Write a protein that binds this ligand. Structure first.
Ligand SMILES: Nc1ncnc2c1ncn2[C@@H]1O[C@H](COP(O)(O)=S)[C@@H](O)[C@H]1O
Ligand SMILES: Nc1ncnc2c1ncn2[C@@H]1O[C@H](COP(O)(O)=S)[C@@H](O)[C@H]1O
Lengths: 126, 124
């Protein structure tokens, strides 16, 4: 199983430490394809190739980010299963387009609190 | 001719006044098409019908990115507008999608958004 991870970078790196813990936990459920200056053309093409190869896409969507949204858009259009993880304690209301994309199966959006991310991942993969 | 406009809402409404100026100007060039489950389905229907997709990408937003992702996969022509004087660096995925043709990303200053739209649509 191959896993593609999405998380804000230029959108803001507030959750960078959490992302590292998510990527470490994903390694027990599959090969993490992502490597979250060749330039942005190179980054885009490399990532699209990885997204095509992915069996599942996991995104932490608490921090707003164009690139995370874009990856999820390309992923849906490729027919990839998607898990989005969101923390309501951020005080933000999650994107209408991401929340509304949820269908409870091919596209899941799960609210979670600090301390629960590993448990959420276990639940999804097991 | 139909146009779909994308701009941050829950990502932040900092540029909402600018979005209204964009939408006003787009009406010269075509019909501007533009709870959550309903919003998503309605918007995907509009996106599928749109001849061109226009996005102001200065404020980071998951929904705007999502719209652009779905639009690329649908084969729509896309214009993204970005303000470098905002002081942030535009998303690697949006900047990297640029090809100078069916996915264009234009840097502009806040006062010249109308001129940027004029240039694109007079060409298109
Ligand atoms: N340097 C990079 N190397 C690999 N991916 C990058 C890189 N920069 C950005 N990304 C991709 O873009 C997404 C973040 O979008 P952004 O708009 O915040 S730059 C990430 O999920 C990641 O997938
Ligand atoms: N209330 C709404 N009605 C129609 N579209 C909405 C609505 N709220 C958000 N959107 C769509 O989501 C995009 C913004 O994404 P966001 O993640 O900031 S909520 C907009 O370009 C818009 O297209």
């Amino acid at each position: 199983r191959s896993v593609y991870f999405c998380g804000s970078i230029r959108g803001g790196r507030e959750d960078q430490a959490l992302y590292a813990r998510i990527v470490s936990r994903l390694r027990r459920y599959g090969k993490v394809l992502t490597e979250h200056a060749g330039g942005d053309q190179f980054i885009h093409e490399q990532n699209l190739n990885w997204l095509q190869q992915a069996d599942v896409v996991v995104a932490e969507v608490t921090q707003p980010s164009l690139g995370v949204g874009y990856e999820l858009g390309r992923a849906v259009a490729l027919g990839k299963p998607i898990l989005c993880l969101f923390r309501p304690q951020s005080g933000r209301v999650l994107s209408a387009m991401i929340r509304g994309a949820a269908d409870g199966s091919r596209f899941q959006v799960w609210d979670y609190a600090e301390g629960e991310v590993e448990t959420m991942l276990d639940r999804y993969f097991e």
